[PDB]
């Protein structure tokens, strides 16, 4: 709705990924994506 509001960051980082692993599948790692590790300040990004 129009009342829903906020800001969002999209930031692109080449290369590998901080991942979690399984014997059947993989997954992403959120911990390595906190604003302190990957600030996303200079990297290519958009803010919606």
């Amino acid at each position: 709705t129009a009342f829903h509001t906020g800001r969002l960051e999209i930031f692109f980082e080449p290369g590998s990924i901080p991942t979690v692993r399984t014997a059947d599948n993989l997954g992403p790692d959120q911990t390595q994506l906190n604003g302190t590790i990957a600030p996303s300040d200079n990297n290519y990004k958009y803010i919606l």
């Binding site: 009342f3 829903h4 509001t5 906020g6 800001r7 969002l8 960051e9």
Partner: protein, 48 residues
């Protein structure tokens, strides 16, 4: 999220996002895939 979602209880306390995908300036190299088993669809069986 760079700023929290602002949403009065007049509406849902959450929202959702959708990720359309397509490509441009596309190109491929060779028709042999990189798997160990040929292509095959999961044709839904009757039951689990």
């Amino acid at each position: 999220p760079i700023t929290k979602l602002m949403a009065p209880d007049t509406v849902s306390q959450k929202v959702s996002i959708v990720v359309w995908k397509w490509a441009e300036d596309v190109v491929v190299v060779e028709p042999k895939p990189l798997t160990s088993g040929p292509t095959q669809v999961y044709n839904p069986p009757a039951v689990a």
